[PDB]
Design a protein around this ligand. Structure first.
Ligand SMILES: COc1ccc(C2=NN(C3CCCCCC3)C(=O)[C@@H]3CC=CC[C@H]23)cc1OCCCCOc1ccc(-c2nnn[nH]2)cc1
Ligand SMILES: [Mg+2]
Ligand SMILES: [Zn+2]
Length: 330
């Protein structure tokens, strides 16, 4: 009757960590009644003044966010609303890095955050290759190419048409076209098949790195600006091993549950079991060390060079977690 319920106060206090790497996102999920994506996005939109800047009516924002969060599958262990919330919040923290201060426009910040929010919406908990090999309707619809990622975009955008869901109703047509293009380029870059090219381009940009007189990154063309945003969200999507170990281990349990469920589905059907999806023949710990050595560390080390020295503690945490998982390999 005016003020917060007690559950709502404890939640508000956890949300004070929203600018920190290592937010207890799972606790936020519990406290919000399984609404971590909605509350975290709302907080971030308020913090960054995005409702004012883009004339987003607050009721429309909340309705859209709830709708978006409802199209993440609660029965999927990893690719659910908690992961969406986590990637949003990690993106938010990366955007605040000192080396990028005043680099990106409000519309770019909106794009990166919105892209993070929608980037795995309606994920079924199985890979692109699974969808392709089973002749799924989605694989048919997108001609086997970035199936899931194309679907995430389509749903993310289509949901804007539900009742009182058009959060971009007051943007001009030029703004909307620009936002749309940037969001598409960002979500399509979350397909791991694109990882090596994104990283090559990120390395190239570190080799030819230019800074302004104030010390901040210089990005004077769309291609470089979008590459940085793409890599930023991609870092957030690959950020689990860089988090405090109590978080990382929950993500690791979750991804493995999801992969093993896919492997069970493959074995039931007589399909070849996909790499690391065989619960009877799997080394969780050795896989994490592989994930870190060949994917996560090379990306984050390159990111860390780009924004040197802002990401040093993130890279230190990653290296510590790697030694931890190495030490548990029997
Ligand atoms: C917290 O744990 C995770 C979280 C997420 C993932 C993901 N995984 N992947 C893929 C597919 C698995 C194979 C490796 C590539 C990553 C996704 O597509 C997901 C969708 C989008 C973003 C990343 C997600 C994987 C996570 O680790 C669990 C599995 C790690 C295995 O990784 C290795 C990678 C390379 C090597 C290797 N050895 N020699 N040369 N290369 C060995 C192992
Ligand atoms: Mg994805
Ligand atoms: Zn993701």
């Amino acid at each position: 009757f005016g003020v917060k319920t007690e559950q709502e106060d404890v939640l508000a206090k956890e949300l004070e960590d929203v600018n920190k790497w290592g937010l207890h996102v799972f606790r936020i999920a519990e406290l919000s009644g399984n609404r971590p994506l909605t509350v975290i996005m709302h907080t971030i939109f308020q913090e960054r003044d995005l409702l004012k800047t883009f004339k987003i009516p607050v009721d429309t924002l909340i309705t859209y966010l709830m709708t978006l969060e409802d199209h993440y599958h609660a029965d999927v262990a990893y690719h659910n609303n908690i992961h969406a919330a986590d990637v949003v919040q990690s993106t938010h923290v990366l955007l605040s890095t000192p080396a990028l201060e005043a680099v990106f426009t409000d519309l770019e910040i909106l794009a990166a955050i919105f892209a993070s929010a929608i980037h795995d919406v309606d994920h079924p908990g199985v890979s692109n290759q699974f969808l392709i090999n089973t002749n799924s309707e989605l694989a048919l619809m997108y001609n086997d190419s970035s199936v899931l990622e194309n679907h995430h975009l389509a749903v993310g955008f289509k949901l804007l048409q539900e009742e009182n869901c058009d959060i971009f109703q007051n943007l001009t047509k030029k703004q909307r076209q620009s936002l749309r293009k940037m969001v598409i380029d960002i979500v399509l870059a979350t397909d791991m098949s694109k990882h090596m090219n994104l990283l090559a381009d990120l390395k190239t940009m570190v080799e030819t790195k230019k800074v302004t007189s104030s010390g901040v990154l210089l990005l004077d063309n769309y291609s470089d600006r979008i590459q940085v945003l793409q890599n930023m969200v991609h870092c957030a999507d690959l950020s689990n091993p860089t988090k405090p170990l109590q978080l990382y281990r929950q993500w690791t349990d979750r991804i493995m549950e999801e992969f093993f469920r896919q492997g069970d589905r493959e074995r039931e059907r007589g399909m070849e079991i996909s790499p690391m999806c065989d619960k009877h023949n799997a080394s969780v710990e050795k896989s994490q060390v592989g994930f870190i050595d060949y994917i996560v560390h090379p990306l984050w080390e390159t990111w860390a060079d780009l924004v040197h020295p802002d990401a040093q503690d993130i890279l230190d945490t990653l290296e510590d977690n790697r030694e931890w998982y190495q030490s548990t390999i029997p």
